[PDB]
Amino acid sequence: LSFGSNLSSFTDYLRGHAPELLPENRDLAPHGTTIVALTYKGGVLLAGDRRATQGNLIASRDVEAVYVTDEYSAAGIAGTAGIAIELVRLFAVELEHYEKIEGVPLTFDGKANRLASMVRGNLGAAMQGLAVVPLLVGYDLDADDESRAGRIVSYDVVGGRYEERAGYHAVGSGSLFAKSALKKIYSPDSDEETALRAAIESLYDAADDDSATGGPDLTRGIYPTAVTITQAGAVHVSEETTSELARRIVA
Amino acid sequence: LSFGSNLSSFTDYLRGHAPELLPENRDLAPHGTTIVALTYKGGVLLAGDRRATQGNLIASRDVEAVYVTDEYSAAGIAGTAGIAIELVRLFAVELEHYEKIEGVPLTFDGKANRLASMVRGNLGAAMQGLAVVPLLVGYDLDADDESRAGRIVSYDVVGGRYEERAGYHAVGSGSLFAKSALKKIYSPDSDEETALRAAIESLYDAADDDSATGGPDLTRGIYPTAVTITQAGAVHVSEETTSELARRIVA
Amino acid sequence: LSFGSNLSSFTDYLRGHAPELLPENRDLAPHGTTIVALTYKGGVLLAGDRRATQGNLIASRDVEAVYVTDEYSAAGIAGTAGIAIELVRLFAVELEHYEKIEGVPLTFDGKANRLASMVRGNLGAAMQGLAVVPLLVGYDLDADDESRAGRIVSYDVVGGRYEERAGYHAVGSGSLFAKSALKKIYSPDSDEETALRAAIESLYDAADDDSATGGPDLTRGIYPTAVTITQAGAVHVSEETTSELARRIVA
Amino acid sequence: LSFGSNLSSFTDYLRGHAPELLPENRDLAPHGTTIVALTYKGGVLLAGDRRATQGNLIASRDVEAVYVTDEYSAAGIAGTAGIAIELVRLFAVELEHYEKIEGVPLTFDGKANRLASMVRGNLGAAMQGLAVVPLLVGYDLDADDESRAGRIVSYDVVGGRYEERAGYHAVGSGSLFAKSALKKIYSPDSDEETALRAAIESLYDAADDDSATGGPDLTRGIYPTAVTITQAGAVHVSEETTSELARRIVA
Amino acid sequence: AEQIMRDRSELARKGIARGRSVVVLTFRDGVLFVAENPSTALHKVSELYDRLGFAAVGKYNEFENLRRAGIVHADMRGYSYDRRDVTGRSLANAYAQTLGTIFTEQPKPYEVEICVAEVGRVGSPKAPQLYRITYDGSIVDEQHFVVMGGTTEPIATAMRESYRADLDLEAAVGIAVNALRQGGVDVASLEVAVLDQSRPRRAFRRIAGTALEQLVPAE
Amino acid sequence: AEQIMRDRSELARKGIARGRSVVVLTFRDGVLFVAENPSTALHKVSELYDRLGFAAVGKYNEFENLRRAGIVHADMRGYSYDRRDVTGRSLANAYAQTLGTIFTEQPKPYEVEICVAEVGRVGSPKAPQLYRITYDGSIVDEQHFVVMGGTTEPIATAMRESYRADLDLEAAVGIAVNALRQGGVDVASLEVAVLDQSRPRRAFRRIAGTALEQLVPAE
Amino acid sequence: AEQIMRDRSELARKGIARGRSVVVLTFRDGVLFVAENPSTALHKVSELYDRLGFAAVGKYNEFENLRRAGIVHADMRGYSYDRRDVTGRSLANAYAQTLGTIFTEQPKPYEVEICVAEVGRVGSPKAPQLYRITYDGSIVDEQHFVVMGGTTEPIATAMRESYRADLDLEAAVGIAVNALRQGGVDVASLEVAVLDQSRPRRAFRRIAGTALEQLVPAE
Amino acid sequence: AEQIMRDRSELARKGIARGRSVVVLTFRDGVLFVAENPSTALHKVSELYDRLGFAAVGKYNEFENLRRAGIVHADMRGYSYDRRDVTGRSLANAYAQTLGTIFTEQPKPYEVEICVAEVGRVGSPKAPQLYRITYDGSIVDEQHFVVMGGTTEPIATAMRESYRADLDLEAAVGIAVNALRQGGVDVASLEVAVLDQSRPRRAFRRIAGTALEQLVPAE
């Protein structure tokens, strides 16, 4: 029975006991959805589309793109769906294992630096068309402004990480449009419902020009997935809160 | 004599005692058939065509594409026949060995997560035209709704897995057509005979537009293979039940 | 002195003591002949052509393409002659060694599964134009119908195996034609002489449209090679029985 | 627990305990900003743009391209942002660890020679379009002329290093223009404010002809990042000092 | 100073000396496994393959390891050839070789004794077979019954003159449960399993409590 | 000169002999962990997985290593299959095998004793399970309580006749805190944790000081 | 303290000392194998190759390993060259080298004694050959008969003055079955096999029970 | 012949027995390091990380190696996560594990005793923490002071009844410099350093001679 990683990194363990499980070692597959992240009074939130496309075909219409990675942080990942899923999973275990070992959770930055390490491992698959890019949000427990504790970190395909601090950000095909809508309808410190509304709205605007998106659809009943993180922790928004906010947006 | 895998994984054993047997290490060959999966009252079912094609040629007309992987789960695999066969076999041993070791069977999700691991290993052969994609169904013993215990999981070539929850799904050349027929003739919670009838019918409709399929043929006596899984377990449907349901469908 | 393979596999032994001898590690050369297999009352039989071609040239006209692999099974192999020969040889040792070790012979299916393993190793050379495909027949000792004990198994280049159960099958350039002749002149349960006659006849018909074949030739005295397998075992048919049956076929 | 590097090099440690972390082992991503370095009376300074571009798109507008690598030295890095960031980080640890081990800091030249070693490792990624080039500045503690203690070192992609001694230098897309502006407005030994002013000005001139730059922007409030190094050490210039000097430059 | 084998042998014999016992026997349905085991979480009897069973005594972790090693070895063979090529004789020999090596090289010998039980295919009229492997790597082929664990002498004879062919299931459970009583009290606090030849595939089945009550005689 | 195992065994038994003790028991909410520990930085009880807990006694660095080894092993299984396939039985066996090997080959045996505690899923009505693994690689499956560390005899009996089902939390804390008092003074200078089955996922929770005050009875 | 070889030698000689015996002899048809063996599952005589036979005594798992080792070595040579290049002399030398090394380096020497029997090709008039290899790696080339296992002295002489050329099959079975009786009762509870030179290829054949009855004389 | 650990333990205890001593204590500003050291080239106290300090006694090269090993381990963690995730607890545990292994396997145990000191972040009101690791791999968490090296008993008590919270810097230097005097003369021929929590990043600072003069009291 192995004694684990010297750095308390589940990843580092695999690196020396099961390399096969790492990304490093390994449209023809469905790809990632558009995902938006907003900062607000309490904490931060992530809202993701549900459209998974492969070619011009719609592969799935109930894709959950946002995950709660840990008590005070969640992340969405766009790109090759398969790769994305595996990546976020490993990331979660990474964080949780560190805690069960060290008895303490990782700093937000620590968590962000790890995600980079992982993305950076997929660089090979990235260059071959199987790229994936995550969007990380979290309630920085070691922060001063309990009002500005929410943070958003974007990524490269080469493993770089970036602090957003613009109040919002996006990733995925519609990201371009979504971000531009937020540039207009997004207001700084505000309700958790105001921000969540702005998000669900930006996905509407993204769906307008991006066929790979097509967010809220009242007729078919397809609604965005969301997750909010505040001093209380990370929680999954209910389909009700979503669909409701969706109809309200419509005129 | 080796003491086996630390994780009780037959695969993991091969990984370190007989790497050659793994997929990871290795039209010019016949390829996989169309396969349909339906969810219904009792449990779930899988029905597969029998046509194996290589080029425009028919290579086999009695191909069994559905296998009982374990007491409460079966799977069909489409793509390079040779690869497919080997894959499903290994998958079965994987499951069975885990049980004989741990004294307990794997959770359905556990079983699905393993199948992914295996598919993911074939990603190299996939990218070289020797891809294979399975369709997994099972009676979730750890489920609440004993009526909704049936589940269907589809796959990527990169190892991703997806929960279907639409009542039906398909894979293989005719998959496209078959799914579209089910979109119309498939009714939710229903007889095991109603669902099995819908399936055999969708294979008829797939055969209409896909030359790689050509399902039920009353003249030659070629009938679909099926397998049902319910609280009683997984059982092979008889040629009678099939051929009979086949004729009844015809007008 | 090594203690042998843990699985009693001569192959597995080479795999770890003399990798160089395995196929895995390694028209510009003469290639394999057309070979036919028929099932009948007693057991099964294999009949093969004698024409080995390299380019448009005839390289050999006395090629023995059918071999007795073991007391109750024989196989023919078509494709790069050199590779083919080595492959069948190894296969024989594989079977025989298992017996001398375990004190028991392998099940027919076991024997077929091994042949696959071997073919599967040549997949690399296959993809480079040095492919070879065997045709395995045997008297299944563990069978119920002592009349249906005969079996025919065909192969892929990727290592897949298939149960024929159509009464006959073929491989090699003329295989296409030969099979089509058997579709007409082949009758189920019948004499060992009736089936052997049908076979030698199908090679005549194959020679008609395939220049890489040219089976029985009364003028030059080139006659097919055959092998029958019945409860008594596998035996080489005599040139007499062949040439005689050959002339009788001619009108 | 490992006893560390024999040469007290953190890098050399990774080289033999965690190769994966090294650059050696590993527009599609945002790339590095324009960076200027000036020598003056007291010490030296580095000023960098904030524009990170990917394609023709602006990826970030608050990129910090200058870092304090150690008490008496800082460096800016242009090229693939992700790679750049990781590189400068490692470089910092490299220096700091050496000190904590040897109890003494590295000579400036020693520090420069290390940076080279690192750049040299990225040569593979460089040749594939993911190149990065740093600009190193420092207050040479082992220098004679306490007035000429400031030094500027430029780099190759193959790991070569060069002593500037021209009073100024630059790197990044606008480097070409920036240098040419300094050729005119840069005066030797002078105020720390005169040099810092010249720098912020050259970034203005670079922004004139380089769309990948666009330095100071009074309307949007985007101002250059700077760092000065003198006998007192390395210190981050304040946004005030920057924005102020920026407006003063404007006519 | 050359017969350390005598010592190592003793270390093992003594370990297997103390600790419960196990009885494996042949009968009408197939093979019966009766072993003294107070626990319900940990086991001493287990399914080896389709027609193979495994039972052991001695130090747990050690015979447990060997148990897994068997499951694996069996599966490997099945995978590589055909499930029908998996034989008790094979695993028996395998074990004999492993224990023999462990005995000779490992620092401390394995305080284990193993029994491999096979039972002909569904149709086949062939009679079940038994194998016993000891800590030093020795094997024997009993066709009637095998005793191991604790003090055997009394239990051995108790069976020696108490065994019969076609011995009914209920009866067999008794034959054994009594051979245990006499020598070394013996309530339904056991682990009983059987290798039912009637079954088409798996053949291994564990006998619960409610069904056991109606099989274990009193004193 | 063959029974060095007797010696090594003694080295361990004596090490675990001195040093504080620990009590793990079953109750209404799930599983209670009461262990003597003056420190607040270092621990003897820890979360193993979602429904597993870990507690040990003996030499720190040694049982600490095993603790990590568990966390990892558990996570691996969860990652490779599903979090729901992670079982106490698995880690228990794992530990049994590890300690057994360490005992046999390592230069100095591990002066450790470990307890693995599992508790059914949120809904499931299944009752918690306990496992104890010793320095030589032996395991047992207690369903009520487990005592280890220091001199057990007195604490064992103190519990032996003081334990009851559905035993309230506050009461249980008492049952144990008293079984400790009598044998081997015992202020709120302990490490107490619990495996609350009411929780949906994590299930492991540490009981602070303020909340402990209202649970630890006096003498 | 240099002649540990004397000891190791003794350990082996004593092991082979106890335990049944075996007789291999030359005759009209080819080579006869008569070995005391109560079992029908495990063997001491086996086919080595086309014209080679193998028989051994001592510790099973050990001589068994060597048996396999031979099958493999023979096959390898046959595969690499031609079946006709496989010779008894080769395997004999091989075995001599292996046992010699095992004796010298392995922790415990192999308590084994081996006999390799060869018989000319179908046509060839050449007379069969025998080889005996001992635990220390020594070999001799007997052309008449070889005795090994248990106490040989009596059986040796019993053959020494009882052997003859062209000795009929039935007679030979007697010659040997008697040499066994006298020294160390001897019913049709043996393992008898032969290397029939009349056969075209395989040459090795096992003699069943019904056919044996009509060959084993009484006392 | 099993308690070689007793011996090895003694070899270490005696090595640490002779040779100077060291005192680490908590106070107003952070953590004080006072260690007897005539040299100015070689050290016994060093910066571990941003908020960590290291001090040791025993054989130089040995505790020196461990010192480096720490610097590396700390940096690795900082690089891999965030400088803020580096904790004394981590290195403490690390060292405990390392010395424990060295003690058990290395040919000669490490004649070393180590102290890891941590001090909360600039703002944070948390009080400094101390850890001591011994040659056998044992650790304790002192919150006031730690004594090691040479004969401790006298120095220990001298501190035991001489320590106070918020103890001024100058005073603390005295408290310790005196506890050293009494037991085992003590001029400004020492190595004194401190872990000043007021500092924003590095936190480790060495106290020179001129500044020390005005801190070390006379006798």
From Swiss-Prot, chains A, B, C, D:
Query: Which GO CC terms are listed, alphabetically?
Result: cytoplasm; proteasome core complex, beta-subunit complex
Top-rank taxon: Bacteria
Give the PROSITE patterns listed for this entry.
PROTEASOME_BETA_2 (PS51476)
- Report activity regulation: The formation of the proteasomal ATPase ARC-20S proteasome complex, likely via the docking of the C-termini of ARC into the intersubunit pockets in the alpha-rings, may trigger opening of the gate for substrate entry. Interconversion between the open-gate and close-gate conformations leads to a dynamic regulation of the 20S proteasome proteolysis activity.
Q: What class of enzyme is it?
A: hydrolase
Q: How does it assemble?
A: The 20S proteasome core is composed of 14 alpha and 14 beta subunits that assemble into four stacked heptameric rings, resulting in a barrel-shaped structure. The two inner rings, each composed of seven catalytic beta subunits, are sandwiched by two outer rings, each composed of seven alpha subunits. All four combinations of alpha- and beta-subunits (beta2-alpha1, beta2-alpha2, beta1-alpha2 and beta1-alpha1) yield fully assembled and proteolytically active proteasomes. The catalytic chamber with the active sites is on the inside of the barrel.
**How is this protein named in the record?**
Proteasome subunit beta 1
- In which organism is this protein found? Rhodococcus erythropolis (Arthrobacter picolinophilus)
Q: Which gene encodes it?
A: prcB1
From Swiss-Prot, chains E, F, G, H:
The record lists the membrane-crossing segments as: none
Free-text activity regulation comment from the record = The formation of the proteasomal ATPase ARC-20S proteasome complex, likely via the docking of the C-termini of ARC into the intersubunit pockets in the alpha-rings, may trigger opening of the gate for substrate entry. Interconversion between the open-gate and close-gate conformations leads to a dynamic regulation of the 20S proteasome proteolysis activity.
Q: List the disulfide bonds.
A: none
What is the protein's known function? Component of the proteasome core, a large protease complex with broad specificity involved in protein degradation. The R.erythropolis proteasomes are able to cleave oligopeptides after Tyr, Phe and Leu, very poorly after Arg but not after Glu. Thus, displays chymotrypsin-like activity, low trypsin-like activity but no caspase-like activity.
| NCBIfam families found in the cross-reference section | 20S_bact_alpha (TIGR03691)
Instruction: Quote the PANTHER family the UniProt record gives.
Output: PROTEASOME SUBUNIT ALPHA/BETA
| UniProt protein name | Proteasome subunit alpha 1
Q: What species does this protein belong to?
A: Rhodococcus erythropolis
Provide the taxonomic classification.
Bacteria, Bacillati, Actinomycetota, Actinomycetes, Mycobacteriales
